[PDB]
Symmetry: C3
Subunit: 229 residues, 3 copies
């Protein structure tokens, strides 16, 4: 394997795998029903990302897409990852603040549109249309961030202090990290092609590990995931 | 873009997009938890259909399927739309009548079979087998209509009068509009090829806008979506 | 159709179809809300398997995968079946013992990984990597079996005696039958190629009918699916 980005795919694979194992072992010896929900959701996230990084590392999760008169390597497995992991991450946030079902459905639905349209944009062969899908996806992302900041922050402040403050930290982490993804896509090989694939891959790896394992480390060490005992 | 059906794809795109915006703005300023559920479900429907009409308009959601000794344009994106939107529409109906979970699972499951087998039939290269899948899908549709008429009508009449009467209207709309889809498929380019694709596309566009935006306009203007206040 | 395995695909198709009809008719005349849930879940399982056996029989659910320097017939439709049916079967078990939501999410998630990685392994063109995916999938399966034996058996014994004893029987059936699948894959055409496809197909057919129709016959004749009346 001589793809230059292989090193970042290997490191992502390793870090997701180690993250999954840590959460799995940490979650052993938890009986609180509420805490079990968070452990289950949060452990699945890097477990799924592990499998999809491994598929990229082994070359399964890569296809060639012709656009701009070239054969462009597109790691389609990222979207398969994000389709399942990003709603789980939003579920962690929503459960934390005890969001109502309708809000959860809107968030997960907007998230599916965001990832779905990003995959279409990534596979689209007419260059200028790629950015049409990027814009729709980014609009869906803005909707999600809107809800997290101006709906979830409303109900969280009415929750327990440990819930309010854990939510606020995870909210901020999410807004910052999630916002970088459309930027990397736009400047990387899926978009304008300014940043080469190997650096794009490093950037997504840093984002993915932070948004998944970092997020989970903050969440799962907090007392907000337990019922008041 | 010189595909003659492009005009109907553009109009569908526009009407779904406008529908989505109307529901989104209308749903702003709703705090009732029950009404939020309906707004969320109903707004997602045309939002999803928007993306899939746009994919057809831009040519992404189209493939060529050889059968009957010809290369037949098959808009596969319709099924991707219907897979997600048709269960959401059934969820609107089920929540309205407070259906039990087992009935909801049966309906959504039968609906997945209906769309799944329709997609297989649409992609199948042996001409006579296409109609085998059409028959299975239509049997799944009959099951759904059975449940809506002879199960949901039973519990709705026990609900609030505004729930009973809003359900009955949406039920009738659904049965009529949904029944036309297998007919259009059978006589159109996916089936017997009597009606040319451009007219088939107009017909599905009229059905889709009615079953989604029309449906949602009836539902979201009714008082049945709010708790009794 | 001269594929030698066609006879087992036809018989599986027939037995799933007959199973579905039996459960459908049997479930007519059930009003208990709890029993309705089980009937809905259990009837969907062979209905889905029916469609996917039929797709294999008609040749839709078959692709050719080059590995080991040969064109290998891979029935990919099995995974499409298993992706939806195996979580439904686990849902039957979990509802029986009234498992908490977090445990259900872990089980369904691990199950998706198990089937997802098996499909990747089945489609992978580098021969030695196929067994990497097989090992990950089998690890996910071991996690599921662990939970069923050393978590579900814990709460079931605290349930009604008819629930405890119906669970224990279905648990044992599941562990035995589910464990055979990775073995058949490993020795069959997807793996080491010791057992030819036609015998592999017979083996999966016997397993599938037992794990689905057999399972459902035990479950749906038990009094554990009803509330105490
Ligand atoms: C939190 C613990 C870690 C903290 C740190 C995290 C850093 C993550 C990102 C690094 C970007 C690296 C960018 C490397 C750019 C190399 C550009 C290059 O090689 O340029 C040569 C080219 O020919 C002409 O530009
Ligand atoms: C509710 C507000 C709107 C109300 C109205 C909704 C109408 C929707 C459907 C119209 C079908 C149009 C069918 C057009 C058929 C044209 C056939 C044609 O061109 O035939 C020539 C051919 O060479 C030989 O048949
Ligand atoms: C429960 C009611 C039914 C009870 C019974 C269920 C049996 C299911 C499995 C049978 C395996 C059959 C294996 C057949 C193997 C044939 C091998 C063969 O043909 O070998 C020739 C070859 O050239 C050199 O090995
Ligand atoms: C190098 C190591 C790589 C990583 C290892 C292989 C990953 C895929 C395999 C198995 C998934 C196992 C299940 C994953 C989900 C577990 C959910 C959980 O922790 O559930 C706790 C809950 O409290 C319960 O009731
Ligand atoms: C309640 C839950 C709501 C969930 C809402 C989900 C909405 C997803 C919407 C749009 C994206 C669909 C993208 C589909 C892309 C398929 C691409 C594909 O498979 O392409 C294969 C090949 O390259 C070409 O045929
Ligand atoms: C021309 C315009 C085209 C259409 C616009 C682009 C469509 C895709 C983009 C964003 C989806 C936004 C989210 C869609 C779902 C919103 C759900 C909703 O309304 O939720 C209300 C609920 O009460 C909350 O708690
Ligand atoms: C509880 C929820 C229950 C949900 C129940 C869902 C049941 C779906 C069943 C059958 C349709 C499956 C259709 C799969 C079609 C895939 C076609 C495809 O991707 O084909 C690619 C290419 O053309 C060839 O390899
Ligand atoms: C040869 C025969 C082959 C098999 C027949 C064709 C299979 C696919 C067609 C229809 C699926 C019908 C719906 C399947 C799910 C029914 C769920 C159910 O039984 O629900 C009971 C519940 O109590 C309700 O409230
Ligand atoms: C809460 C619910 C949790 C659910 C957890 C699910 C996790 C699935 C993880 C990994 C498998 C993904 C496998 C994706 C395989 C796609 C293969 C494919 O479509 O390949 C087409 C073609 O052969 C090549 O491009
Ligand atoms: C664990 C991984 C996470 C949190 C991934 C998040 C990914 C995104 C927020 C992706 C967003 C995109 C856009 C808003 C537009 C362009 C395409 C995407 C999919 C990269
Ligand atoms: C918003 C879109 C809606 C309500 C679409 C409904 C679609 C159907 C009821 C499709 C039904 C079909 C059959 C019953 C058999 C042939 C194939 C289908 C998928 C067109
Ligand atoms: C109705 C069908 C059932 C219960 C199918 C069960 C299937 C499995 C437990 C499959 C398991 C696999 C492995 C553990 C590794 C190799 C690949 C699989 C998918 C065959």
């Amino acid at each position: 394997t001589g793809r230059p980005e292989w090193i970042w795919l290997a490191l992502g694979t390793a870090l997701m795998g180690l993250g999954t194992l840590y959460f799995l072992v940490k979650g052993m010896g938890v009986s609180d029903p509420d805490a079990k929900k968070f452990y289950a959701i949060t452990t699945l996230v890097p477990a799924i990302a592990f499998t999809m990084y491994l598929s990229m590392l082994l070359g399964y999760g890569l296809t060639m897409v012709p656009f701009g008169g070239e054969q462009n390597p597109i790691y389609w497995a990222r979207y398969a990852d994000w389709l399942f992991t990003t709603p789980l991450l939003l579920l962690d946030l929503a459960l934390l603040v005890d969001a109502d079902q309708g809000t959860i459905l809107a968030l997960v639905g907007a998230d599916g549109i965001m990832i779905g349209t990003g995959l279409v944009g990534a596979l689209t062969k007419v260059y200028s249309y790629r950015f049409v899908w990027w814009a729709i996806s980014t609009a869906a992302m803005l909707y999600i961030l809107y809800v997290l900041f101006f709906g979830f922050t409303s109900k969280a402040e009415s929750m327990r202090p440990e819930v309010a403050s854990t939510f606020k930290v995870l909210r901020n982490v999410t807004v910052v990290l999630w916002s970088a993804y459309p930027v990397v896509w736009l400047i990387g090989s899926e978009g304008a092609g300014i940043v080469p694939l190997n650096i794009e891959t490093l950037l997504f790896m840093v984002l993915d590990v932070s948004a998944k394992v970092g997020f989970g480390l903050i969440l799962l060490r907090s007392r907000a995931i337990f019922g008041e005992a």
